[PDB]
Design a protein around this ligand. Sequence first.
Ligand SMILES: NC(=O)C1=CN([C@@H]2O[C@H](COP(=O)(O)OP(=O)(O)OC[C@H]3O[C@@H](n4cnc5c(N)ncnc54)[C@H](OP(=O)(O)O)[C@@H]3O)[C@@H](O)[C@H]2O)C=CC1
Ligand SMILES: NC(=O)C1=CN([C@@H]2O[C@H](COP(=O)(O)OP(=O)(O)OC[C@H]3O[C@@H](n4cnc5c(N)ncnc54)[C@H](OP(=O)(O)O)[C@@H]3O)[C@@H](O)[C@H]2O)C=CC1
Ligand SMILES: CN(Cc1cnc2nc(N)nc(N)c2n1)c1ccc(C(=O)N[C@@H](CCC(=O)O)C(=O)O)cc1
Ligand SMILES: CN(Cc1cnc2nc(N)nc(N)c2n1)c1ccc(C(=O)N[C@@H](CCC(=O)O)C(=O)O)cc1
Ligand SMILES: COc1ccc(C(=O)O)c(NC(=O)c2ccc(Cc3c[nH]c4nc(N)[nH]c(=O)c34)cc2)c1
Ligand SMILES: COc1ccc(C(=O)O)c(NC(=O)c2ccc(Cc3c[nH]c4nc(N)[nH]c(=O)c34)cc2)c1
Ligand SMILES: O=c1[nH]c(=O)n([C@H]2C[C@H](O)[C@@H](COP(=O)(O)O)O2)cc1F
Ligand SMILES: O=c1[nH]c(=O)n([C@H]2C[C@H](O)[C@@H](COP(=O)(O)O)O2)cc1F
Lengths: 506, 506
Amino acid sequence: EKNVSIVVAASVLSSGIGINGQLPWSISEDLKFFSKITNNKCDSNKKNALIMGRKTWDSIGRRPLKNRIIVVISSSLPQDEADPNVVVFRNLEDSIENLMNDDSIENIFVCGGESIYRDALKDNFVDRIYLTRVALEDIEFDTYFPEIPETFLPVYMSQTFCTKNISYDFMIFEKQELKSIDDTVDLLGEIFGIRKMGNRHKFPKEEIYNTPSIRFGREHYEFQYLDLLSRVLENGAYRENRTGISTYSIFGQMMRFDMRESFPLLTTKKVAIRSIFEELIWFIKGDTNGNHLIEKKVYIWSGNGSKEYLERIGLGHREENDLGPIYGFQWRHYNGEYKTMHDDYTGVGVDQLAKLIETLKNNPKDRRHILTAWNPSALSQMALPPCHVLSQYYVTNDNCLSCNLYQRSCDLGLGSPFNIASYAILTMMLAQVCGYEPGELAIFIGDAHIYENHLTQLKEQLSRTPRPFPQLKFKRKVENIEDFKWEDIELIGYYPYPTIKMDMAV
Amino acid sequence: EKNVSIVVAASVLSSGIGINGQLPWSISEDLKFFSKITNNKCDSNKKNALIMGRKTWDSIGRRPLKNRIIVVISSSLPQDEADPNVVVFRNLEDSIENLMNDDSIENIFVCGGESIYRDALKDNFVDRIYLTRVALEDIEFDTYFPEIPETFLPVYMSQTFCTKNISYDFMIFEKQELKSIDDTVDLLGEIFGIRKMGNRHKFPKEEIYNTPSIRFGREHYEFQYLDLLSRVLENGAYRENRTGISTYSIFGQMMRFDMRESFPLLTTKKVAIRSIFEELIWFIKGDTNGNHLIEKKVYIWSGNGSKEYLERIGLGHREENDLGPIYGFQWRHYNGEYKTMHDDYTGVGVDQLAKLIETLKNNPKDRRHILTAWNPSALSQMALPPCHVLSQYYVTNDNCLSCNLYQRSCDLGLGSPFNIASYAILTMMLAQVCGYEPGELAIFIGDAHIYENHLTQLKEQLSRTPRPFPQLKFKRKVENIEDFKWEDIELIGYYPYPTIKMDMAV
Ligand SMILES: NC(=O)C1=CN([C@@H]2O[C@H](COP(=O)(O)OP(=O)(O)OC[C@H]3O[C@@H](n4cnc5c(N)ncnc54)[C@H](OP(=O)(O)O)[C@@H]3O)[C@@H](O)[C@H]2O)C=CC1
Ligand SMILES: NC(=O)C1=CN([C@@H]2O[C@H](COP(=O)(O)OP(=O)(O)OC[C@H]3O[C@@H](n4cnc5c(N)ncnc54)[C@H](OP(=O)(O)O)[C@@H]3O)[C@@H](O)[C@H]2O)C=CC1
Ligand SMILES: CN(Cc1cnc2nc(N)nc(N)c2n1)c1ccc(C(=O)N[C@@H](CCC(=O)O)C(=O)O)cc1
Ligand SMILES: CN(Cc1cnc2nc(N)nc(N)c2n1)c1ccc(C(=O)N[C@@H](CCC(=O)O)C(=O)O)cc1
Ligand SMILES: COc1ccc(C(=O)O)c(NC(=O)c2ccc(Cc3c[nH]c4nc(N)[nH]c(=O)c34)cc2)c1
Ligand SMILES: COc1ccc(C(=O)O)c(NC(=O)c2ccc(Cc3c[nH]c4nc(N)[nH]c(=O)c34)cc2)c1
Ligand SMILES: O=c1[nH]c(=O)n([C@H]2C[C@H](O)[C@@H](COP(=O)(O)O)O2)cc1F
Ligand SMILES: O=c1[nH]c(=O)n([C@H]2C[C@H](O)[C@@H](COP(=O)(O)O)O2)cc1F
């Protein structure tokens, strides 16, 4: 008995693998993966066998692959014995029976087009599936990869990679047919109740774990958000808050995302990326006028900015959407004497963002690149205290800009998908203006919570296996960071699940 | 062949297990652990065998244990058949007959005093060791647990638990004699270099991993600091900084500690706990006069408070140790016009700490319990910008006080052990003044680094297997939080490794 794995690079949605006898794409690193996964063997005196159909054998030039043995499935090709690295069989079945019991062969790989993929799964010959999900769908395919049978479960999903602005994943699918430590920890959990901290951070149950079959291969960094949801649904304490909608809350959580090879925009739900940007540039410009977002069809600050809400918190003297000194005011005019949203605050206050950009490129290894928004002297004047209170930035030795954010209160479901992408765009903006590349984004959270009217919505989101992250590139290089416009943003390869409506708690 | 494990509760240093025919302590949760570990079986029609010496059989009243079979090793006790739950053997070797003959026994446990522990290890009869390390050493013992032979390696170390102000651990020692995901992840790391985020966060090598045999049982929360050291020594980028001493730096790390059942004071080195307190109460009183610490034999702010250093950073107008508006000033007088360290700042500024204590007990579920020290309007006047910039506090549903701290720059080796205990004491002080209990402490770190002159020292610290955390209790309840004194603090059960001298980078 030996192992028979499928290697395939297919589209993310329709599972397309070819067009007009060739690939729909040219990804160098993906072919390198095919090379390394098919050469992976234990015995140096053995070789791996690569099974492929004739039309696929034509697409690779009918030339052998080093250190491997190509098995071509063809009804017409002559069974030439002159080439030992290429053998022909009349059907797929006689090429599995012959490869196994052939001690010179260690592993078997199926990789030969739709006709071979489809008949290898229908006849139950395949043990593993190496899938490369490529985020390209608005093009034309003519050969597809069959739908993965239910007998297979995913066990690994890599981080999203980027080649020529094309996002792709790497997944492993297995066919589903030390313990003394686990016993002792369970016994200690019975003796001590909540006294054992492990019981206060119980591992989420399978019913609330997104794609629970991926146990050890949760490399895709959207799991940093999906698993935080699961940890809240498992350990969240039911608590009241300033609004009429209670939450399930835990304390002290973190999420980290890559920004070099992808953009952390959630794929399990269509995230309103346009509104995220318009709010971010609204912060950068130092603007606290809530109408300037409503004038651009962005209504995320209408609830916390209505006349009825402001009178409720004792700010009835403000205009209809005068949010007061908040994120935008503290970034550009810290400790500035706020009057109204119509006054001219040029020069007043401490321009943190300007000093940040100046310090990022003049003293890159300075570990004080800090942008804060928590000003106790102005909290009473704010329509809402800052949720993302403090961010720190870091220039790596390879000229990348990483970002750390501390968030005191995190509305998973509404605020969190925005904060993940918002500070991701901000770091990219800071990276271009300072002449660096994007690095990493880590979000440290205080009150990570889920509003009780988001439960059926967020549980629906957990039922969706993540897709590769999109790409975010800028159309032009900007002089000043304030000059960014929405038209200057290109969102490449974003194929999310349908949007999920969730009401905001005012 | 069947499993033979040792269950023992011994002292932390001298490994004392008894005195005058009884235990040196009375810990209820430990006996329950003995009960659950010796009753844990797979077959319901089988029983576990507990081997013990005669003197131990006397200490438990010569009465059977439910659902188990006691095996007494005695040269004088008659081999009476009237009790089926108690059997006597003339030597330890002839009592290991449960492996061969008596199939009715599923597991074997040795737990019967020094004479039985010592010759059971000398004759290589033991497979596992369940160790309960009790932090009691300045008392009298007369029977000890033998030194664990090198053939055993620790595989688990629980968090520190507390019973009647006594700290204890739980450890497992083993006798030393699918991987398709790991291959795929390794290959992806060869294709993409630093592009794969996993390669920028490499798992530390065994040569720098503290107690590397404990792979899956790193529950003791001192590992949250020791593994951060290893994570820095593995991925730390060599970088220059404001001092003449370069560091190995990574970005975006976190440590979380329990405070309910223990106090996070590092045991791998004798940490100057008194200096940590005297600095913290110095912060609480709003004091920025560096002499008040030197007058109390606390010299941690002497380097950043020399006349030569102050002139170097452009503060030559200050007195010898006028550190300027820092942690203490921003906590009690935020946005206060600082003059010198001799002026009376009573009433000026925003007293965050007073508002924090006021809001903590009046609005416990308010997710805005934030104490910040990052004031950009005053950074230029500070002798050193705040390293621990922002802390948030959280009241759990069971009336516990958890704490989150964001630290922009973390000197592992000097500042970090201080920052761990400092904010642990601060959270405990806030818990008493507000009427709560200690909860959890999480420290989110930006620039986690190791100064290059701390390398040989921190590698020495990593060679020391951690010991259970101590306990920190207050002698009296205080009226105002400022009234705490060093004599009001009791440090119970702190048995650390010898101190490690490390020079501070000015
Ligand atoms: N993205 C990816 O991972 C991959 C993509 N591709 C692409 O897919 C396309 C090719 O796939 P596809 O169109 O399905 O062609 P195939 O690669 O599946 O090859 C089919 C040929 O194999 C022979 N064959 C197939 N089934 C049998 C059978 N049951 N008995 C006997 N002979 C059989 C036939 O040749 P004959 O007429 O001689 O009998 C048939 O024409 C190309 O574009 C290729 O580049 C290919 C591999 C991988
Ligand atoms: N903290 C913990 O986990 C534990 C602590 N203890 C403590 O340890 C103390 C007891 O230990 P200890 O003083 O060493 O006494 P032991 O419990 O080890 O019992 C010793 C007796 O066992 C018999 N015995 C021992 N070796 C042999 C042998 N080679 N052949 C025949 N008989 C043998 C002898 O009894 P005889 O005279 O009849 O021949 C001997 O007096 C007590 O204080 C007890 O509370 C005990 C167990 C666990
Ligand atoms: C069968 N076929 C089509 C093809 C293309 N992309 C794929 N991508 C994936 N992920 N899986 C496949 N099965 C796959 N198959 C192939 C097979 C090998 C090579 C190839 O040139 N392999 C070289 C790769 C050389 C390199 O790029 O480093 C090797 O050394 O194996 C190209 C197309
Ligand atoms: C042999 N002996 C001395 C003793 C005391 N403390 C220890 N502690 C540890 N961790 N390991 C031991 N082997 C150990 N042995 C014993 C053994 C059993 C009981 C005992 O009362 N056991 C009850 C515990 C009942 C309970 O508190 O729930 C049981 O059900 O097993 C006391 C002393
Ligand atoms: C996922 O589904 C969708 C689809 C579309 C949109 C969209 O804007 O088009 C969307 N976002 C929102 O509605 C949204 C609203 C407010 C904020 C910021 C904010 C200010 N005050 C707050 N108070 C609380 N409690 N929570 C918060 O998040 C905030 C962010 C997002 C969500
Ligand atoms: C672990 O071994 C020992 C033993 C004894 C002592 C002891 O004081 O007795 C000790 N601590 C220190 O020397 C020490 C010095 C300064 C601080 C705070 C601080 C202010 N400015 C800084 N600048 C940098 N770069 N780093 C920093 O840590 C700080 C904390 C600790 C360490
Ligand atoms: O950027 C934001 N991120 C966020 O998580 N919230 C949510 C968190 C919480 O639901 C609410 C904060 O209100 P409070 O912390 O005062 O209870 O806003 C709001 C934002 F604007
Ligand atoms: O409480 C402290 N914590 C801490 O980690 N440091 C260290 C971190 C770093 O080595 C230095 C901060 O100086 P800077 O970050 O400006 O380089 O002090 C200092 C303190 F006072």
